[PDB]
Design an enzyme around this catalytic site. Structure first.
Site, PDB file in Angstrom:
ATOM      1  N   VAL A 281      30.204  22.399  42.665  1.00 30.02           N
ATOM      2  CA  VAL A 281      30.545  23.621  43.732  1.00 30.02           C
ATOM      3  C   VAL A 281      29.806  23.964  44.952  1.00 30.02           C
ATOM      4  CG1 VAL A 281      32.142  25.037  43.713  1.00 30.02           C
ATOM      5  CG2 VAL A 281      32.053  24.178  41.638  1.00 30.02           C
ATOM      6  N   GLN A 282      29.045  25.324  44.704  1.00 28.60           N
ATOM      7  CA  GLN A 282      28.816  25.929  45.334  1.00 28.60           C
ATOM      8  C   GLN A 282      26.945  26.149  45.619  1.00 28.60           C
ATOM      9  OE1 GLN A 282      28.261  29.928  49.157  1.00 28.60           O
ATOM     10  NE2 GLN A 282      30.699  29.164  47.640  1.00 28.60           N
TER      11      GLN A 282
ATOM     12  N   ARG B 160      30.443  12.993  37.944  1.00 23.98           N
ATOM     13  CA  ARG B 160      31.897  12.171  36.851  1.00 23.98           C
ATOM     14  C   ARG B 160      32.903  10.934  37.602  1.00 23.98           C
ATOM     15  NH1 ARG B 160      33.568  14.317  31.944  1.00 23.98           N
ATOM     16  NH2 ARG B 160      33.534  16.287  32.596  1.00 23.98           N
TER      17      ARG B 160
ATOM     18  N   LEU C 240      29.239   8.590  37.199  1.00 23.74           N
ATOM     19  CA  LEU C 240      28.285   8.342  35.682  1.00 23.74           C
ATOM     20  C   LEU C 240      28.943   8.904  34.482  1.00 23.74           C
ATOM     21  CD1 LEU C 240      25.447   6.859  34.963  1.00 23.74           C
ATOM     22  CD2 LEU C 240      24.300   9.439  34.351  1.00 23.74           C
TER      23      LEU C 240
ATOM     24  N   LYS D 206      27.592  11.099  28.660  1.00 21.33           N
ATOM     25  CA  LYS D 206      27.914  11.092  26.903  1.00 21.33           C
ATOM     26  C   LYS D 206      28.942   9.293  26.726  1.00 21.33           C
ATOM     27  CE  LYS D 206      30.298  14.654  27.175  1.00 21.33           C
ATOM     28  NZ  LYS D 206      31.174  16.378  27.255  1.00 21.33           N
TER      29      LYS D 206
ATOM     30  N   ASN E 105      23.902  23.017  37.757  1.00 17.84           N
ATOM     31  CA  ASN E 105      24.791  24.321  37.231  1.00 17.84           C
ATOM     32  C   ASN E 105      25.789  24.315  36.410  1.00 17.84           C
ATOM     33  OD1 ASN E 105      26.196  23.052  39.290  1.00 17.84           O
ATOM     34  ND2 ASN E 105      26.516  24.763  40.166  1.00 17.84           N
TER      35      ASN E 105
ATOM     36  N   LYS F 204      30.394  33.365  31.351  1.00 18.48           N
ATOM     37  CA  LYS F 204      30.135  32.874  32.683  1.00 18.48           C
ATOM     38  C   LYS F 204      30.427  33.396  33.851  1.00 18.48           C
ATOM     39  CE  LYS F 204      33.876  30.317  29.981  1.00 18.48           C
ATOM     40  NZ  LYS F 204      34.975  29.664  30.428  1.00 18.48           N
TER      41      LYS F 204
ATOM     42  N   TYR G 233      30.744  34.171  38.415  1.00 18.77           N
ATOM     43  CA  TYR G 233      30.437  32.794  39.656  1.00 18.77           C
ATOM     44  C   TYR G 233      30.644  34.091  40.707  1.00 18.77           C
ATOM     45  CZ  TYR G 233      32.261  29.336  36.426  1.00 18.77           C
ATOM     46  OH  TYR G 233      31.922  28.620  35.577  1.00 18.77           O
ATOM     47  N   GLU G 234      30.639  33.840  42.014  1.00 19.74           N
ATOM     48  CA  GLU G 234      30.609  34.328  42.892  1.00 19.74           C
ATOM     49  C   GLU G 234      30.765  35.698  42.526  1.00 19.74           C
ATOM     50  OE1 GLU G 234      29.321  33.461  46.059  1.00 19.74           O
ATOM     51  OE2 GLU G 234      29.302  35.413  46.673  1.00 19.74           O
TER      52      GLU G 234
ATOM     53  N   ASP H 158      26.246  32.729  45.015  1.00 23.91           N
ATOM     54  CA  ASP H 158      26.846  31.136  45.278  1.00 23.91           C
ATOM     55  C   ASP H 158      25.812  30.776  45.821  1.00 23.91           C
ATOM     56  OD1 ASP H 158      28.728  31.438  43.375  1.00 23.91           O
TER      57      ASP H 158
ATOM     58  N   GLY I 288      19.062  52.304  55.623  1.00 19.71           N
ATOM     59  CA  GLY I 288      17.553  52.486  55.769  1.00 19.71           C
ATOM     60  C   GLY I 288      17.499  53.600  56.355  1.00 19.71           C
ATOM     61  N   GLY I 289      16.545  53.686  57.212  1.00 14.55           N
ATOM     62  CA  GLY I 289      15.634  54.892  58.193  1.00 14.55           C
ATOM     63  C   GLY I 289      16.174  54.896  59.521  1.00 14.55           C
TER      64      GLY I 289
HETATM   65  S1  LIG Z   1      30.659  29.918  44.657  1.00 14.41           S
HETATM   66  C1  LIG Z   1      31.108  29.912  42.856  1.00 14.41           C
HETATM   67  C2  LIG Z   1      32.176  28.920  42.181  1.00 14.41           C
HETATM   68  N1  LIG Z   1      33.249  28.995  41.261  1.00 14.41           N
HETATM   69  C3  LIG Z   1      33.200  27.760  40.448  1.00 14.41           C
HETATM   70  O1  LIG Z   1      32.942  27.106  40.695  1.00 14.41           O
HETATM   71  C4  LIG Z   1      34.591  28.499  39.786  1.00 14.41           C
HETATM   72  C5  LIG Z   1      35.015  26.951  39.636  1.00 14.41           C
HETATM   73  N2  LIG Z   1      33.701  26.016  37.886  1.00 14.41           N
HETATM   74  C6  LIG Z   1      34.450  25.872  37.093  1.00 14.41           C
HETATM   75  O2  LIG Z   1      36.027  25.776  36.266  1.00 14.41           O
HETATM   76  C7  LIG Z   1      33.353  24.800  36.306  1.00 14.41           C
HETATM   77  O3  LIG Z   1      31.569  26.324  36.559  1.00 14.41           O
HETATM   78  C8  LIG Z   1      33.246  23.567  36.739  1.00 14.41           C
HETATM   79  C9  LIG Z   1      33.208  23.504  37.966  1.00 14.41           C
HETATM   80  C10 LIG Z   1      34.020  22.849  36.083  1.00 14.41           C
HETATM   81  C11 LIG Z   1      31.843  23.158  36.292  1.00 14.41           C
HETATM   82  O4  LIG Z   1      32.058  23.403  34.922  1.00 14.41           O
HETATM   83  P1  LIG Z   1      30.809  22.592  33.403  1.00 14.41           P
HETATM   84  O5  LIG Z   1      29.534  23.703  34.036  1.00 14.41           O
HETATM   85  O6  LIG Z   1      30.823  22.800  32.527  1.00 14.41           O
HETATM   86  O7  LIG Z   1      30.818  20.862  34.507  1.00 14.41           O
HETATM   87  P2  LIG Z   1      31.611  19.688  34.333  1.00 14.41           P
HETATM   88  O8  LIG Z   1      32.964  20.470  34.564  1.00 14.41           O
HETATM   89  O9  LIG Z   1      31.343  19.052  35.149  1.00 14.41           O
HETATM   90  O10 LIG Z   1      31.252  19.858  32.898  1.00 14.41           O
HETATM   91  C12 LIG Z   1      31.319  19.414  31.558  1.00 14.41           C
HETATM   92  C13 LIG Z   1      31.503  19.063  30.277  1.00 14.41           C
HETATM   93  O11 LIG Z   1      31.343  17.993  30.096  1.00 14.41           O
HETATM   94  C14 LIG Z   1      29.637  17.206  30.584  1.00 14.41           C
HETATM   95  N3  LIG Z   1      29.620  16.882  31.864  1.00 14.41           N
HETATM   96  C15 LIG Z   1      30.005  17.226  32.870  1.00 14.41           C
HETATM   97  N4  LIG Z   1      29.026  15.630  33.890  1.00 14.41           N
HETATM   98  C16 LIG Z   1      28.867  14.699  32.966  1.00 14.41           C
HETATM   99  C17 LIG Z   1      30.067  13.312  33.552  1.00 14.41           C
HETATM  100  N5  LIG Z   1      29.786  13.046  34.947  1.00 14.41           N
HETATM  101  N6  LIG Z   1      29.580  12.320  32.539  1.00 14.41           N
HETATM  102  C18 LIG Z   1      29.752  13.107  31.364  1.00 14.41           C
HETATM  103  N7  LIG Z   1      30.236  14.312  30.347  1.00 14.41           N
HETATM  104  C19 LIG Z   1      29.666  15.219  31.494  1.00 14.41           C
HETATM  105  C20 LIG Z   1      28.620  18.849  30.365  1.00 14.41           C
HETATM  106  O12 LIG Z   1      27.537  18.774  29.626  1.00 14.41           O
HETATM  107  C21 LIG Z   1      29.914  19.651  29.777  1.00 14.41           C
HETATM  108  O13 LIG Z   1      29.833  19.800  28.467  1.00 14.41           O
HETATM  109  P3  LIG Z   1      30.308  20.781  27.413  1.00 14.41           P
HETATM  110  O14 LIG Z   1      29.630  20.465  25.705  1.00 14.41           O
HETATM  111  O15 LIG Z   1      31.273  21.012  26.958  1.00 14.41           O
HETATM  112  O16 LIG Z   1      29.421  22.065  27.627  1.00 14.41           O
HETATM  113 CL   LIG Z   2      35.131  31.544  40.787  1.00 13.82          CL
HETATM  114 CL   LIG Z   3      29.038  27.567  42.235  1.00 11.05          CL
END
Ligand SMILES: *SCCNC(=O)CCNC(=O)[C@H](O)C(C)(C)COP(=O)(O)OP(=O)(O)OC[C@H]1O[C@@H](n2cnc3c(N)ncnc32)[C@H](O)[C@@H]1OP(=O)(O)O
Ligand SMILES: [Cl-]
Ligand SMILES: [Cl-]
Ligand SMILES: *SCCNC(=O)CCNC(=O)[C@H](O)C(C)(C)COP(=O)(O)OP(=O)(O)OC[C@H]1O[C@@H](n2cnc3c(N)ncnc32)[C@H](O)[C@@H]1OP(=O)(O)O
Ligand SMILES: [Cl-]
Ligand SMILES: [Mg+2]
Lengths: 427, 427
Positions: free
Chosen positions: A15-16, A37, A71, A74, A95, A136, A138-139, A168, A259-260
């Site tokens: 994201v950001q 992912r 990649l 898990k 993040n 959780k 965000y912004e 962000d 401010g001033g």
């Molecule tokens: S400026 C403000 C912006 N606002 C937002 O971003 C709001 C929307 N955001 C979201 O919905 C989440 O923050 C997103 C962007 C979906 C990210 O969520 P996560 O921080 O959980 O990151 P992932 O979705 O990528 O991870 C989910 C679970 O899977 C694991 N994981 C991440 N990446 C991988 C890869 N490449 N391969 C295997 N597994 C991966 C994470 O560790 C995470 O595990 P949990 O144990 O389920 O937490």
């Molecule tokens: Cl959000």
């Molecule tokens: Cl973000």
């Protein structure tokens, strides 16, 4: 030479906030490998796309100067690849949610074992140890948590979010400071550190001036430069006048200076049909005689009720209401030049349309046209720090998994091992 | 031990942006020597004072971890002292008006002559080469210049300034990245560089998301996540409908989500009498079933009019309005706790009073009580970046010229020759 040439960044960010940080490191020469992912990748790729099945502007404007590898982390072979990448990384950036990186077998203690020199940098919602450490954020939630929303907007309206990415991107820029600081200490210690920036804290840093005001208010019961301190000007919802009598927390001050040096947002010609036809006019103390010449009221020059901040403080809105009447037939650029010929601090509200296509911003490399031969060219914001001996070279954002094999070959894997990893669905 | 231990900063900075940068460098261990004008000093000393003849919280909250020397730099004796100080410095930092340091006779060219290792860091209103490069800019003027004002507030109101210091402190934090980046290359090159940050550029960097929106708007004619995308929702002051048919520059979207998922600022119990009794509530696309459970609208789960982002475009503000009715009898903290049960991103508008006395922020060192035995203790914002290997030690802001003789002693001057400088009114 670029500052971060030879710095290897293992970039888990999405994201950001995280991607702003790692992109800006990329702009300064770092080698950014974005871990994504399989199949989907960074959520921004599909976030409000302007063309079906083409990576969005959200993605491209935050992911230039990066390479993408897919990649599955898990899986056993994926964790192995990651251990190899961590051993070559200078900085890991994430993040994810709290605990997420631990849960897939990469605690800080283990990361240190794999690579004593690597820095682990994280964006968090609230700081580790906070009561709300697990919420959780965000912004705009972060803008709310850090005091910005409460102090932005008008006294007779709601808390108001900033259009700027106070949560962000601001957190990302703060984390970049943390990372560079950790690199500096590593030169001396030979060891990597953990560094984290909570969005609430990044926001709080930028509202330091409002914590100044909270203490002033607690100590004195008044903030005399705020609109509420002018007798019978600010009115509440029911229609009655506002004062600091019953205000114990920093209130919203509309378009006050903060401010001033008092100021206000003043209408210019066309304001009814052009939402950005405004200037901001600041009353600098040394520039007060110059203002009296432009506005043409020389009585005020020598009047002690008008020629001192303390004299002016109880009728700021009366002076602003009057000065605004002088701008009624001039556009914001004409008002700006009319003030500028008295050396006065007055500036226009620049629209995004104006900014996107402004010659100067493109001349200085702050708005940059990215040559993207895949998607078509787009504009982005460049590096906001300008260096005497270095110029960023911004290159287009990566396709999902575009550099997977390139990065895998750099680790030292043979062509048969790469085909196995693809066949086994780890990359 | 600390990142910037042993880094000598020659600090010319005054008011907000520059002093924020050098204070944070101080927090990370830098040796900051703040040069001030004789008699009056940094003008923040006398702005917004809470007690007569005591340095204001405006000054103390921006000038902890610094020593102060008084100096008239428009004297032959002052200029000679600067040359000695420049030779001992790693970083020079200034936020005077454009050209000011050059007119004193310390151009980048001459500074390099004096010290090939020293970094020159500047905050200016506009970038070098910009049409407005010579303009003096203050906080809200910079917000206006960088796109923030135009994109902050409501569609039926004026451009709105942010309570957060997007112009000043934000520019200082950006300059810190530049300074740290220049320190990183200096390890390779052995040479200092000039780094400069324009306030306009620092603002625009945080408004990158609105440059995404400008391009989306230009490319497609609509921003579907904005309130104006809802038919018959938004109106100007004379009641004319606001839709993207007639919008060509990114509009003000009130409390819409920005770079986050769609959201809004919702009233909680007590909003009529407490200006900060609100939450920010987000409707993230993948959380719709959870939201439907929370507000008891099971019928909305399987209805395509409600269950995709695209179906909600024509009614999202109606949905927010209905959600808000569920918060009428609950304060912002119970709403936050309720939403967190569902994992829905949501949090309170924290008041400055709540933040100043929050135990969690003092626990994690983000709000810090500074021990000031001369002025009385005060709160400040500490380092927003948290490190595994060190903690800032924040110490009180200096009195004007408190360290003049101390600093002169270190330069190699003895007792007889500092008395001459006092006599000539140089220090
Ligand atoms: S400026 C403000 C912006 N606002 C937002 O971003 C709001 C929307 N955001 C979201 O919905 C989440 O923050 C997103 C962007 C979906 C990210 O969520 P996560 O921080 O959980 O990151 P992932 O979705 O990528 O991870 C989910 C679970 O899977 C694991 N994981 C991440 N990446 C991988 C890869 N490449 N391969 C295997 N597994 C991966 C994470 O560790 C995470 O595990 P949990 O144990 O389920 O937490
Ligand atoms: Cl959000
Ligand atoms: Cl973000
Ligand atoms: S964060 C919000 C503030 N904005 C900025 O930081 C942007 C950069 N700063 C500026 O544009 C100006 O410094 C602002 C803040 C607008 C204030 O403007 P001033 O009208 O105060 O102009 P200067 O700060 O440039 O100061 C005027 C002259 O005074 C000289 N000077 C300062 N300090 C000393 C000392 N100690 N001794 C001798 N002279 C000193 C400056 O060099 C400057 O010289 P001129 O050549 O006459 O301009
Ligand atoms: Cl500030
Ligand atoms: Mg239910």
């Amino acid at each position: 030479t670029k500052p971060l040439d030879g710095i290897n960044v293992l970039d888990f960010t999405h994201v950001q906030a995280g991607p702003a940080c790692t992109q800006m490191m990329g702009f300064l020469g770092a080698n950014v490998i974005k871990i994504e992912r399989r199949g989907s990748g960074d959520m921004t790729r599909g976030w409000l796309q302007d063309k079906p099945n083409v990576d969005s502007l959200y993605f491209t404007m935050f992911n230039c100067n990066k390479r993408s590898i897919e990649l599955d982390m898990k899986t056993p072979e994926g964790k192995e690849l990651l251990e190899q990448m961590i051993k070559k990384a200078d900085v890991m950036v994430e993040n994810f949610g709290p605990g997420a990186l631990d849960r897939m077998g990469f605690t800080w203690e283990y990361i240190q074992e794999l690579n004593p020199r690597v820095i682990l940098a994280s964006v968090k919602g609230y700081a580790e140890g906070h009561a709300n450490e697990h919420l959780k954020v965000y912004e705009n939630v972060a803008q709310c948590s850090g005091g910005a929303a409460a102090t932005t907007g008008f006294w007779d309206g709601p808390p108001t979010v900033s259009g700027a990415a106070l949560g962000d991107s601001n957190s990302g820029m703060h984390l970049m400071i943390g990372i560079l600081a950790a690199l500096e200490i590593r030169h001396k210690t030979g060891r990597g550190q953990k560094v984290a920036v909570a969005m609430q804290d990044a926001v709080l840093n930028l509202v330091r001036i409002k914590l100044r005001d909270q203490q002033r208010l607690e100590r004195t019961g008044i903030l005399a430069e705020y609109p509420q301190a002018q007798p019978n000007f600010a009115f509440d919802r029911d229609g009655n006048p506002l004062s600091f009598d019953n205000i114990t927390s920093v209130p919203r001050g509309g378009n006050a200076g903060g401010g001033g040096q008092p100021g206000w947002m003043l209408k210019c010609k066309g304001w009814e049909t052009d939402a950005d036809s405004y200037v901001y006019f600041t009353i600098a103390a040394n520039m007060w005689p110059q203002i009296c010449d432009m506005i043409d009221k020389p009585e005020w020059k020598d009047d002690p009720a008008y020629n001192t901040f303390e004299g002016r403080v109880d009728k700021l809105m009366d002076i602003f209401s009057f000065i605004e009447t002088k701008f009624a037939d001039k556009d914001k650029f004409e008002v700006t030049e009319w003030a500028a010929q008295y050396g006065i601090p007055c500036g226009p509200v620049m629209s995004m349309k104006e900014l996107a296509h402004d010659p100067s911003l493109q001349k200085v490399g702050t708005v940059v046209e990215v040559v993207d031969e895949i998607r078509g060219n787009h504009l982005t914001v460049g590096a906001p720090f300008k260096f005497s001996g270095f110029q960023p070279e911004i290159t287009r954002a990566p396709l999902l998994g575009e550099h997977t094999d390139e990065v895998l070959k750099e680790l030292g894997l043979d062509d048969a091992k790469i085909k196995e990893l693809h066949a086994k669905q780890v990359v």
